[PDB]
C-alpha cells in the first residue's frame, strides 16, 4: 500500500508545448508566443533567372528599340521571339543616333508583339537613289545603316516626288518603322537631297501621320549634326498603307508582324541560370508558392502580390506556457 | 473564445507526449500510462490544411503590367503611374495585415473550444461517478485499471456496473 | 463546430421537422408531443434579416467610367486604363471573398451558440434532477405528464413540488 | 408499454436531405441547409427604357450625330441620359478624322445634350453653304448641317477678321473644323492662293493649325480630308478666328453643362421594365450585390466580380438523414 | 457569440460601479459588501489597448499626390484621374465599415464570455456544496463568513472543511 | 428576516451598467446599446494651417508659376524653398499675358522640387538688344519685364543667326526656361526682329525641342494682343546645351536647381497661424490620431484616408441592459 488507498488515478491532461516557440500577432494581442508558425512571404532570391516555363531572350547591351531598328551590334536578334525580353543597364549605340516621340509606346507595343518576323517588300523606287550608306554607322567593317530601314538620296541632280503605295491582302496587320532625317546644315540638305524644303504626310482610311523635318544644329555624337527621328503606323488588312515625300524620307524596307501574346519586357541585370520557376523579378526568379512577397515590385507571370510587411505570421498550433515560470 | 483553457484547468502541462496534441495522463496503482485521442488531433489538421490550401496553390498569373520605374523626370503622366503604383500596394499591405490577423484568433479560439469539446465529452459519459478537482482533472471515485481506458473511448463502456460503487465512497 | 453541437452531442438531424428549426420531443406512456419554441428561433431570423438588410438593397452611384473595350492599339496610356480597371477587379474579387467565407464560419458558430443555449437552460430548471446518457437526451427520474412540457418551454418549472419524489427514486 | 420512471427528453435541430454546397474558411464542400445566390449570373438581353432616357443608335455614331450627317438628320436638338452606339452602324458622306477621339466623344457625353441656336456670324468677301457631291440629300448635294464650308468668292480671299463675343451664364462649344485638299488643283479652285493658315485664339488658350496638302487613299472617289477640333468659351471671354483658306466655319455651338449623361455601346434593342442598372449584355436586377456578365455599367449596378458563384450559408450544419 | 447575452439568465447589475468593471455580491448577516477585481481586468484591458495601439501612432505619410480638383474640363486625361480617385475611396470605404463591424462584434462576443467564463470556474470550485440558483445566483445550502467569500476572490478554496455541514442540509 | 439568513447565504453576480447607452453597429442587431465607445473619423477642423513642422510659403495674391517667371508682384519669392506652396483663388497676373502646354506637367515639376536657386551665368550675346520693355507692366512705379528672362530685340537693322552653347561642368540637374514670342499683328514682328518667318530650336544630347511661332490677329488683354508660349528643358550633367534661333527668343537668364524631396502644391484659403500639427487639409488642419477622415481628399502629410462615412463607431464594452424590466 504505497499511499495510493485504490481511491484515484486523477484521469489528468495534458497538451503539446515547445519552450522556443515564435511570435506572432493578432487582433487581441501582437505579442503571443505559439508552439509552431510559418511565414507567408518569400523575402530571398537565388540570384539567377531561369527559364524552363517561359523562352527568355538575353539583351546582350542591346535594348527592344535599337534590335527592332538594327544596329550592327545587334545582328544575332533578326527573326527572334521571346517570352520576356530583358534590357542591360550597359546597353548603348554605335550607329546614328535615333530620337522618336512617346519612346515608351513604341517600346510597349513592339513588346506586347512578341515576335519580329520581318518581311522585304517590293517597291518602284524609280528616279530616287536607294541603299544609302554611312561612314560612321559601321557594319561589319564596312559602312552601312540600319538595317530595317533605307535611307533615301536624290540620284543625279533631281529628288520626284514620291507617290507609292503598298495594299495590305493579308489577315494578319502590318507594322511599320519609317524615320525622317533632320540634315544639321543647309549644305548637307542640298548635298543629300538636291531640294531645300520637304515634308512628308502619310495617310491612311483611319489615322494621318504627316510631321515636317525641321532642320538645325545639334551637339555633335560621334561628329555628326544630323539626328533622325522614328515614326510608326500600323495598318488594318482593310485599308491601305501611302506614303507620299518630297524630301527627308527614311523608307522601310518592309512590314513587321504584330500578334497577341504574352510577352512583356524588363530591366535587369542578373545572370541567367537553369531551374523551373514561373515567376521571374528583377532581382532574379523566386518560387511562386507563397501567396505574398517583398522581394520586387516588378512582376511577371504567377508572381505573388506585393506586400510592403516584412514578416507575416501564421498560426499552426495554439498558446504556449511560458514553462515553469507560474 | 479562450474560454480560460491555458491559465486556467491546464497548470502548466508536461512538453512531452509528441505523438499527438492531446492526450490524456493517469497514475495508478500500477504506474503511469499515455493516450493521445488521435480522432481530435486529425479534426483541427484538416482546419489548417483548409486554410493553406486557400492561399498556397491559388496565385493569380499577370503578363504585361505597366512600367514601374522612371530614370527620368516626366510630366502628368509619371505622377500618374506612379499614383496608381502606390495606392495599390497601400491597399494589399493593409489587406495582408488584416488577413492574418483574423485568421490566427480564429485558431487559437477554434484550438480552445477543442479541448474544451474533449471536456465536455468525457464529463457527459461519467453521470456521477466523476467529479472535477478544477486543474484538469478527473476524480475517478472508483476502482479502475487498463481495462477502463480500451472500453471508455471506443463505443464500448456500461457505467451501471459503477454506479454502486462510487455512493459508498464518495459520501462515507 | 466549435460548440461540439455536431460530432457526438446530438449524432443527427430530424428530416419529418419542416415547421421549425428547434424543438422538443419526448417519450413517455401517453405519446410523442413534439413542440417548437418559437422565443429562441425569433434570434435567428432577426439576426440573418438584418445582415441581409445591410448586404441587399444597397446600390453604389456610378455614371460615367472611362472606356473598358479598345477596338484600335494605343500607347502606354491604352495600357494604364487597362490596368487600373484589373487591379479595382481584383481586389473587389478578393473583398467578396472574405465578405463569403467569414459571415460563413460565423453563422455556423452562431447556430451552434442557440444548440449549446438550449442545451445548458435545461440544466438550470432541472438542478440534480437530469444527467444526459451521451446522445443529447436527459434521463428525468419521475413522472411527466404533460403538466410538464407546458413548464419546462414557458420556463415556468419549478423543483420543489417535484424534490422529494425525484431524489427518493434515483437513491434509494 | 412505458413505465412512468422511463421519461426521457432530446433536443436537436432540422435538417434538408437537398443539401448545397457552401464555400467556407474550414472547408470548400459544406454542406448547408439553404443558401441563397450573391452574384447574377444572368440577364433578360435586352434594355429596359423607364427609369432613364435612352437614345437609339439607329446606325449612327454620336460624332455623325454631332456634326449633322445627312443620314443621321433625325437626331437635331435631342437630349439623352444614356447614348448607345451600335457595333455595325456606318457612315457614307464626306471623310473625316478628328485629334483625340476619344477625348470629344467623352466631353459631349457628360453633358448628353445638343441643344443649339442660330448665330449670325459677320461674314463679307466669302461665299457659304459649300456643298460636295460625296454626300446627297434628296437626290442632290449636301454637307454637314452643323459646319459651314468655305469656299472662294470671285479670284481674291478678304483678310479674315471675325469674332462673336459670349456674354451668357453657361460654357459653349464651338465645333470648328479644317479642310485638307488632295490635290494643288483643288486647292486653287476652293481658295485661289498657294497656301492657307488657321488660328483662333480665346482669352486663356489659343489654338493653331496649318493644313497640309498632299494626296491620301480614295474614299468615296475623294482624297480630301477634314479634321475637326474644338474649343470651349467660357463667359466673360471671347472667341476671335484670323484665317485665309481652308476655314471651315462653325455655324453656331453646343451647350455644356455637368450631368449624368454617360455613354455605352451595346447591340441589344430596347425594352420596358422597371429595371435601372444597365450592362450591354442587358439589363439586371439589383437585388445580387454582385454581378459577372460586363465589368460595363451604367446607374445604380452592383460590384463585378470573377468568380462564377458565391453561396452564403443562412443555417447551420446540415446532417443529411441517419447514418444509413 | 452571444454566451450568456448578460439578459434573461442574468439581469440589470450595479450602476454605482466606478472602480472596476466587474464584482461580486454576498448575502449574510453582516452586510452585503460588494468589491471589484482586478483579476479579470489584465485580461480585459489588453485586448483595448491591444485593439488601438495598432491604429492610433501607425500611420502611412504622404508627400506628393495627384490633383483631384479641376477648374477646367479636358478629355481622357481628366477623366482618368477623377476615376482612380473614386475607386481608392470606395475601397478604403468599404474596408473601415466592415473592420468595425468584425471587431465590434468580436470585443462584445469576448466580454459576454467573459462572465460565462467566470461562472463555470466558480462552478468547478464548489464541486458539490453548492447549487446554481438559476438567476445569476449561486445557493450555498451552509453559512459563509466574510472569512469564507476571501477564498472565493482568492482562487483558493478548500471543500473538506464545509463538506459535512453542507451535504446533510442539501438533500435532509 | 434574520431567522431565514442562518443557513441561506447566496453569492451573484452582475456586471458594468451605464444609464446612457451609445448606438454602434455591427454585422449582427445593427441597433444595439453599448456602454462605452470611441469615435473613428475626425470632422472638426479649426480653420488655420499649423506652422511648426516644415515651414509652409505664402501665396500673397502669387502662384507658383509667376514665381518662377519672376512677377513684379511675386518679387517676394526669389530664392526661397519650401515644403508645400499654398495658392490663392484671388491670385491674378497682370504683367504680360502668358499660356503654357502641358500646364500640370510644369507645375508639379517645380512643386515637386521645391526649390528655386536661381544662378546668373553668363552667355556671349552679340548683335542684339536685350532688356525688352512694354509699358503695360509696371515694376517699382516704372516699367519693366519678367525679371528671368530676356526679350531679345533688334540691333540697327541686323538680327544675326543665334548658335549658343552651355556646357555642364557640375554633377546635379538644371532647368531652363526659353520661351517663344506670338506677335499680334505683321507690323509689330517686322518692327521688332526685322523679319517675316521665325523659328527657335533647343537642343540637348538626349531630347530636342522645335516649334514655330504662330503669327495672327489674337483678343487684346490691359492693351496688349501678343502672347509667348514658355517651354522648358531638363540637363543632364555632361550634357551640351545648344540653341538655334532667328527671332522671338524669350532668353533663359539661367536655371532652376533640381532637388528631389518631400514638397508639394496645395490650393486653399485658410489663413496661416501659430500652432501644432502633422497633417495639412484644404480646409485646415486636423490630428493625426484618427486612423480615419471625411474632411477633405486633398492631404499632405501623415494624414488618415478619406472615408465616405458620417460618423464610425468602435464598441469597447458589453452590451447594455435595458434596466427596470
Ligand atoms: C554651333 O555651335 C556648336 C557648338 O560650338 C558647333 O559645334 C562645334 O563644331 C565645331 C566645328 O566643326 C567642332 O569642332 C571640331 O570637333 C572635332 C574634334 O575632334 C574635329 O572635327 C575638329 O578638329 C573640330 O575641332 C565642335 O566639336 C562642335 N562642338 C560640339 C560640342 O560638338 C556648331 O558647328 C555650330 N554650328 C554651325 C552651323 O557652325
Ligand atoms: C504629294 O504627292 C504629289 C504628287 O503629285 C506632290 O505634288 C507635286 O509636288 C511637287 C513639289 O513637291 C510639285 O512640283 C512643283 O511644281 C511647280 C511647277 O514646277 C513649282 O511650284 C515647283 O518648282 C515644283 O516643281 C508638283 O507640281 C506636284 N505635282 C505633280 C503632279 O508632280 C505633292 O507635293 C506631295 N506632297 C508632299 C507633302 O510631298
Ligand atoms: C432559403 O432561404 C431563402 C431566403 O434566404 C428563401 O427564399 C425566399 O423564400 C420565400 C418563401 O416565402 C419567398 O417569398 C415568396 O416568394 C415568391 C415571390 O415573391 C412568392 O411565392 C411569395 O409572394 C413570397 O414573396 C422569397 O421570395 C424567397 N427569397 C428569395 C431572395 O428568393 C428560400 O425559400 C429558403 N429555402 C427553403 C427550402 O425554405
Ligand atoms: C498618288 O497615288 C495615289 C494612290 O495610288 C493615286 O490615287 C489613285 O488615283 C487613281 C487615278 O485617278 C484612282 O483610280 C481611279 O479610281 C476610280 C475608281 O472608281 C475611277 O475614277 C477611275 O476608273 C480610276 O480607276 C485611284 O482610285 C486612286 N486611289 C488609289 C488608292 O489607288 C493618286 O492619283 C496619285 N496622285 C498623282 C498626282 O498621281
Ligand atoms: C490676320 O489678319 C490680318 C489682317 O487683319 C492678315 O494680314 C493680311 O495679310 C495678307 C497676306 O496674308 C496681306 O496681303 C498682302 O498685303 C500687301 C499689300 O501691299 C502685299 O504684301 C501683298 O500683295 C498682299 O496683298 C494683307 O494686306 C494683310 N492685311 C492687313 C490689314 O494688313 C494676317 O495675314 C492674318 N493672319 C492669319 C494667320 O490669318
Ligand atoms: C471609454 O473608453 C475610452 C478608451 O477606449 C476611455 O478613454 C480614456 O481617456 C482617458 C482620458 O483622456 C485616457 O487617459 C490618458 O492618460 C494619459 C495620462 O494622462 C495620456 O495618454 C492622456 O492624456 C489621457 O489622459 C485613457 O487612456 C483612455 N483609456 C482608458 C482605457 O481609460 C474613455 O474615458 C471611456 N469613457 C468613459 C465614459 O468611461
Ligand atoms: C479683329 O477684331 C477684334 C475685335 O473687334 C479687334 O480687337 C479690337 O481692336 C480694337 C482696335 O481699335 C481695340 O480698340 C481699341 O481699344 C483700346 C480701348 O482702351 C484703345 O487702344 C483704343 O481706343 C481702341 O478703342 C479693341 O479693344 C479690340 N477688342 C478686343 C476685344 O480685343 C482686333 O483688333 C481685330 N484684328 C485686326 C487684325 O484687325
Ligand atoms: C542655325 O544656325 C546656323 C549658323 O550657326 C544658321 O545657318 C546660317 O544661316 C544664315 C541665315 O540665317 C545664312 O546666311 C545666309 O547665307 C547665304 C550666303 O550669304 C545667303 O542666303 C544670305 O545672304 C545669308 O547671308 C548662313 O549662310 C548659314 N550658315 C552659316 C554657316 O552661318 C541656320 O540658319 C540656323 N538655323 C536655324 C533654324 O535657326
Ligand atoms: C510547423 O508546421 C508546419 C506545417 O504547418 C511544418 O512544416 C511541414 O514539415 C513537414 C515535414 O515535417 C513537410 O512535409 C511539410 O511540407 C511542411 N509544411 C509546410 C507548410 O511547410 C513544420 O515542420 C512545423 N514546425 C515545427 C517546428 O514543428
Ligand atoms: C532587389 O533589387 C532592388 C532594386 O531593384 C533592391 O532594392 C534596393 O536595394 C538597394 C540596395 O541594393 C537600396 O539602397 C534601395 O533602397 C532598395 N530599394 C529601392 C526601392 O530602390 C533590393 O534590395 C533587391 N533585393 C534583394 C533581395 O537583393
Ligand atoms: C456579355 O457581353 C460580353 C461582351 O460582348 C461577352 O463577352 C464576350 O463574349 C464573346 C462571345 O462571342 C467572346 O467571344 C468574348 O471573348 C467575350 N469577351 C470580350 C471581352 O469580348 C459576354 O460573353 C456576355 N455575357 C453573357 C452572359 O451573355
Ligand atoms: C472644404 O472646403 C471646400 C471648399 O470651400 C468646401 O466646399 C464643398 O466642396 C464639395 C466638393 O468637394 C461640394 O460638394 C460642397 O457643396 C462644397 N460646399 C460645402 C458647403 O460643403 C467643403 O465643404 C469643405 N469641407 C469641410 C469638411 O469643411
Ligand atoms: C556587346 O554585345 C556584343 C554582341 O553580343 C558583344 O560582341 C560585345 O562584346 C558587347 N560589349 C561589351 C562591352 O561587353
Ligand atoms: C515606277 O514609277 C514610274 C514613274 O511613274 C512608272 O513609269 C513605272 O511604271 C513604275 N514602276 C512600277 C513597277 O510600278
Ligand atoms: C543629270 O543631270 C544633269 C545636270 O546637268 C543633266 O544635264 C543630265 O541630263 C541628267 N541626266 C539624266 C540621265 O537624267
Ligand atoms: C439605319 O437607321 C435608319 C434610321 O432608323 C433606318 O432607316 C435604316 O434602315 C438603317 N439602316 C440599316 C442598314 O439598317
Ligand atoms: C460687320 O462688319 C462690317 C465690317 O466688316 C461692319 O461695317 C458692319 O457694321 C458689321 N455688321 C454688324 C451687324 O455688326
Ligand atoms: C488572499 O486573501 C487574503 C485574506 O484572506 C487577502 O489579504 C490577500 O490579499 C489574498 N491574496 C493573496 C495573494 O494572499
Ligand atoms: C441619460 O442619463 C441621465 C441620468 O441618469 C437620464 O436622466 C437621462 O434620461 C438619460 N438619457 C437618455 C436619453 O435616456
Ligand atoms: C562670342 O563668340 C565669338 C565667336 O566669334 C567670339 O569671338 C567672342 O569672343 C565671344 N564673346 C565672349 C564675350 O565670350
Ligand atoms: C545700320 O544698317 C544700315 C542698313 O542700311 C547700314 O547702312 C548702317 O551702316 C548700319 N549702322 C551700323 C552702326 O551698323
Not at chain 1, 543597364?89 to 509606346?105: E, F, G, I, L, R
Not at chain 1, 557594319?139 to 507609292?164: D, I, K
Request: hydrophobic share 30%; aromatic share 8%.
Amino acid at each position: 500500500i504505497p499511499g495510493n488507498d485504490n481511491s484515484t488515478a486523477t484521469l489528468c491532461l495534458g497538451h503539446h508545448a515547445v519552450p522556443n516557440g515564435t511570435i506572432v500577432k493578432t487582433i487581441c494581442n501582437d505579442r503571443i508566443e505559439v508552439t509552431n508558425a510559418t511565414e507567408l512571404v518569400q523575402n530571398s532570391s537565388i540570384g539567377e533567372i531561369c527559364d524552363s516555363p517561359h523562352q527568355i531572350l538575353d539583351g546582350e547591351n542591346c535594348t527592344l528599340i535599337d534590335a527592332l531598328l538594327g544596329d550592327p551590334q545587334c545582328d544575332g536578334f533578326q527573326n527572334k521571339k521571346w517570352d520576356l525580353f530583358v534590357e542591360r543597364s550597359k546597353a548603348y549605340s554605335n550607329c546614328y543616333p535615333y530620337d522618336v516621340p512617346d519612346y515608351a509606346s513604341l517600346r510597349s507595343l513592339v513588346a506586347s508583339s512578341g515576335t519580329l518576323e520581318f518581311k522585304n517588300e517590293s517597291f518602284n523606287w524609280t528616279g530616287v537613289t536607294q541603299n544609302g550608306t554611312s561612314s560612321a554607322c559601321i557594319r561589319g567593317s564596312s559602312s552601312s545603316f540600319f538595317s530595317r530601314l533605307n535611307w533615301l538620296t536624290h540620284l543625279n541632280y533631281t529628288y520626284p516626288a514620291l507617290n507609292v503605295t503598298m495594299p495590305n491582302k493579308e489577315q494578319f496587320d502590318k507594322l511599320y518603322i519609317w524615320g525622317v532625317h533632320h540634315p544639321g546644315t543647309d549644305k548637307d540638305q542640298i548635298f543629300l537631297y538636291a531640294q531645300s524644303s520637304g515634308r512628308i504626310t502619310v495617310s491612311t482610311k483611319r489615322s494621318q501621320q504627316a510631321v515636317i523635318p525641321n532642320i538645325g544644329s545639334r551637339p555633335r555624337i560621334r561628329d555628326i549634326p544630323s539626328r533622325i527621328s522614328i515614326y510608326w503606323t500600323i495598318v488594318k488588312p482593310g485599308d491601305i498603307l501611302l506614303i507620299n515625300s518630297t524630301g527627308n524620307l527614311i523608307a522601310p524596307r518592309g512590314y513587321f508582324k504584330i500578334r497577341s501574346g504574352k510577352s512583356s519586357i524588363m530591366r535587369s541585370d542578373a545572370p541567367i541560370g537553369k531551374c523551373k520557376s514561373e515567376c521571374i523579378t528583377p532581382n532574379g526568379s523566386i518560387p511562386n508558392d507563397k501567396p505574398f512577397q517583398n522581394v520586387n515590385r516588378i512582376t511577371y507571370g504567377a508572381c505573388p502580390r506585393y506586400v510592403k510587411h516584412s514578416t507575416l505570421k501564421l498560426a499552426t498550433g495554439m498558446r504556449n506556457v511560458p514553462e515553469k515560470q507560474t | 473564445g479562450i474560454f480560460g483553457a491555458i491559465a486556467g484547468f491546464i497548470e502548466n502541462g508536461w512538453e512531452g507526449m509528441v505523438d499527438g496534441w492531446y492526450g490524456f495522463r493517469h497514475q495508478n496503482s500500477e504506474g503511469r500510462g499515455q493516450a493521445a485521442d488521435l480522432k481530435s488531433t486529425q479534426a483541427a489538421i484538416d482546419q489548417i490544411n483548409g486554410k493553406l490550401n486557400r492561399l498556397i496553390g491559388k496565385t493569380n498569373e499577370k503578363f504585361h503590367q505597366i512600367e514601374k520605374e522612371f530614370s527620368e523626370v516626366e510630366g502628368r503622366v509619371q505622377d500618374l503611374e506612379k499614383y496608381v503604383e502606390d495606392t495599390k500596394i497601400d491597399l494589399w499591405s493593409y489587406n495582408a495585415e488584416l488577413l492574418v490577423a483574423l485568421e490566427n484568433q480564429h485558431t487559437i479560439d477554434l484550438t480552445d473550444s477543442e479541448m474544451n469539446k474533449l471536456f465536455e465529452k468525457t464529463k457527459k459519459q461519467l453521470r456521477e461517478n466523476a467529479e472535477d478537482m478544477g486543474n484538469g482533472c478527473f476524480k475517478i471515485y472508483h476502482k479502475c485499471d487498463n481495462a477502463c481506458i480500451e472500453s471508455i473511448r471506443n463505443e464500448t463502456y456500461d457505467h451501471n456496473v459503477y454506479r454502486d460503487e462510487a455512493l459508498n465512497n464518495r459520501f462515507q
